[PDB]
């Protein structure tokens, strides 16, 4: 299937590229996510005539993501409280939803889909390092302090 990329897609190409991808790749991911469109004559001519504003919007999105990442980094450390045993091990667990809620209460709005926990979901009291992905290329870090 021939498609026109509407953004930067890793291992595929840059915006405006015309690429041949597997039909399922286009059908179930790229088009529904908005990262590409079918390479019909209408689409090709329309995009080529109306192209540059899209890079302007992509730059605006990247700048907004950078600003949000800077705010997240400036937030530094966020503290979450739960219940645990005397050994410091939590009976329950601390996940993306409540981490994002704590960050939002701290001031920066982050969705649960932007939380990236490398070593699974937190289960012990102490300090952990969590990552945030607000853009496909930028990354932020937050210290999480779990207390009883």
Partner 1 sequence: SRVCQVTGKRPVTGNNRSHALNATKRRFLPNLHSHRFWVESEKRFVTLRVSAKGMRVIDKKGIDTVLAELRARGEKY
Partner 2 sequence: AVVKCKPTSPGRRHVVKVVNPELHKGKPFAPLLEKNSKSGGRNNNGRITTRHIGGGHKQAYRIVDFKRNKDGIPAVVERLEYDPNRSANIALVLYKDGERRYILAPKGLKAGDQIQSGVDAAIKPGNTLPMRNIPVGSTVHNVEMKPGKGGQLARSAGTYVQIVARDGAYVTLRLRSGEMRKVEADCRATLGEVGNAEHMLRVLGKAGAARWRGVRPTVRGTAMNPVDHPHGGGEGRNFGKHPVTPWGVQTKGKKTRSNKRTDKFIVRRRS
Partner 3 sequence: MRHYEIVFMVHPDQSEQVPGMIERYTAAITGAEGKIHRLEDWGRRQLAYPINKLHKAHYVLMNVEAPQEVIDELETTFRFNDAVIRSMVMRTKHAVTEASPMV
Contact 110, 132 (CB under 8 A): yes
Rounded CA separation 112/109 (Å): 10
**Secondary structure letter of residue 107 according to DSSP:** T
For partner 1, the closer CB: 16 or 38: 38
Residues 25-54, one symbol each (x = binds partner 3 by CB under 8 A, - = not), give ------------------------------
Question: 73 and 141 in contact (C-beta within 8 Å)?
Answer: yes
Residues between 21 and 60 that touch partner 1 (CB under 8 A): 23, 27, 31-32, 38
> Per rule CB under 8 A, is residue 107 in the interface with partner 3?
no
Q: Give 46's contacts (C-beta < 8 A, 6+ positions apart).
A: none
Would you say 92 or 118 has its CB closer to partner 2?
92
Smallest distance from the beta carbon of 87 to partner 3, in angstroms? 6
């Amino acid at each position: 299937m021939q498609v026109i990329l509407l953004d930067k897609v890793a291992n595929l190409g840059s915006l405006g590229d015309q690429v041949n991808v597997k039909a399922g790749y286009a059908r179930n991911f790229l088009v529904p996510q908005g990262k590409a469109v079918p390479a019909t004559k209408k689409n090709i001519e329309f995009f080529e005539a109306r192209r540059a504003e899209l890079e302007a919007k992509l730059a605006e999105v990247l700048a907004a993501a950078n600003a949000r990442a800077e705010k997240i980094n400036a937030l530094e450390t966020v503290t979450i409280a739960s219940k645990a045993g005397d050994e410091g091990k939590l009976f329950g667990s601390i996940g993306t939803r409540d981490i994002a809620d704590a960050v939002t209460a701290a001031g920066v709005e982050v969705a649960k889909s932007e939380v990236r926990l490398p070593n699974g979901v937190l289960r012990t009291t102490g300090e952990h390092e969590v990552s945030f992905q607000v853009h496909s290329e930028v990354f932020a870090k937050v210290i999480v302090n779990v207390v009883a």
